[PDB]
């Protein structure tokens, strides 16, 4: 997209750095910063725990630009067919990250922003409404934060 | 498959 | 300020997670994500190595809302008076982080968004111009990322 | 002091 100001992006870097240092001490820049950090911790632990059990998931999908959407939709639809919970939401994120890593391994990085949009839209329409009614983002931070 | 893996092993991580 | 859309903040969470996961494999969502990551790591490392140095400093300062700015300016000016380099850039960041942490310990949370503004301005006007001339943000990434 | 500190110990860290 078009170029923003130098100052907007210098701000964004400063805030990222300061958010990180604040969270290291039990503080937070914002509810967003607290969620980002808890989610990164969560995905690391989920992957440390359980990747050995589905380590060839993204590989068996045989991803290509033409089949990527259908493969993403199939996994994500199955992942939540019998319901939503916090652990499956974490898995939804780990899976999208693995699918992006897989896409770059296969020299298909045009898929990374695509996966990002598909995830954002799914979060928006199918996950946040469950999140709202099950304690909100604060409950996720309470359950997965500082871990 | 690595569905009903990324299934029980999400569920196992639910708090 | 005014509230944005639920949709924009969902995108931002998603881009944040994918950024992290890509960088763990030596990939990057963008030059910004790569810089963010390398700087987080540079900072943890700088602070671990030179923690006694920080211990000395952020006592000797005695921050208060009416003096916080004067302290920031004095430290930052001497850090860069005879030159910028990548290590001094990291020290600047770590210094601002400690200043924010200390403000919150002493219940002067008001200073945190101010210190951010002063850091961002100084990065904009003094630090990024050097970087633009000295190899760019990519050089920083090749030096401190991986 | 804790200046020509944060100087020497930036300059050590410089790659």
From Swiss-Prot, chain A:
Effect in UniProt of substituting residue 87 to A: No heterodimerization with BAX
Motif BH3, chain ranges: 35-49
One of the GO biological process terms: defense response to virus
Domain of life from the UniProt record: Eukaryota
Keywords: Apoptosis, Cytoplasm, Cytoplasmic vesicle, Cytoskeleton, Endocytosis, Membrane, Mitochondrion, Mitochondrion inner membrane, Mitochondrion outer membrane, Nucleus, Phosphoprotein, Synapse, Transmembrane, Transmembrane helix, Ubl conjugation
GO terms for MF: BH3 domain binding; channel activity; identical protein binding; protein kinase binding
Post-translational modification: Proteolytically cleaved by caspases during apoptosis. The cleaved protein, lacking the BH4 motif, has pro-apoptotic activity.
Function: Potent inhibitor of cell death. Inhibits activation of caspases. Appears to regulate cell death by blocking the voltage-dependent anion channel (VDAC) by binding to it and preventing the release of the caspase activator, CYC1, from the mitochondrial membrane. Also acts as a regulator of G2 checkpoint and progression to cytokinesis during mitosis. Isoform Bcl-X(L) also regulates presynaptic plasticity, including neurotransmitter release and recovery, number of axonal mitochondria as well as size and number of synaptic vesicle clusters. During synaptic stimulation, increases ATP availability from mitochondria through regulation of mitochondrial membrane ATP synthase F(1)F(0) activity and regulates endocytic vesicle retrieval in hippocampal neurons through association with DMN1L and stimulation of its GTPase activity in synaptic vesicles.
Domain comment in the entry: The BH4 motif is required for anti-apoptotic activity. The BH1 and BH2 motifs are required for both heterodimerization with other Bcl-2 family members and for repression of cell death. The loop between motifs BH4 and BH3 is required for the interaction with NLRP1.
Subunit comment: Homodimer. Interacts with BCL2L11. Interacts with BAD. Interacts with PGAM5. Interacts with HEBP2. Interacts with p53/TP53 and BBC3; interaction with BBC3 disrupts the interaction with p53/TP53. Interacts with ATP5F1A and ATP5F1B; the interactions mediate the association of isoform Bcl-X(L) with the mitochondrial membrane ATP synthase F(1)F(0) ATP synthase. Interacts with VDAC1. Interacts with BCL2L11 (via BH3). Interacts with RNF183. Interacts with GIMAP3/IAN4 and GIMAP5/IAN5.
Protein name in the entry: Bcl-2-like protein 1
Gene: BCL2L1
């Amino acid at each position: 997209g078009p170029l923003g100001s130098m100052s907007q992006s210098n701000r964004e870097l400063v805030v990222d750095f300061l958010s990180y240092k604040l969270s290291q001490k039990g503080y937070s820049w914002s509810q967003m910063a607290a969620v980002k950090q808890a989610l990164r911790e969560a995905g690391d632990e989920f992957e440390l725990r359980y990747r050995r059990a589905f380590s060839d998931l993204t590989s068996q999908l045989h991803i290509t630009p033409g089949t990527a959407y259908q493969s993403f939709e199939q996994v994500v639809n199955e992942l939540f067919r019998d319901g939503v919970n916090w652990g499956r939401i974490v898995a939804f994120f780990s899976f999208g990250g693995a699918l992006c890593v897989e896409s770059v391994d296969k020299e298909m990085q045009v898929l990374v922003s695509r996966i990002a949009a598909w995830m954002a839209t799914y979060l928006n329409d199918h996950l946040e409404p469950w999140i709202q009614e099950n304690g909100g983002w604060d409950t996720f931070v309470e359950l997965y934060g500082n871990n | 498959x690595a569905x009903r893996x990324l299934x029980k092993x999400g569920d196992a991580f639910n708090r």
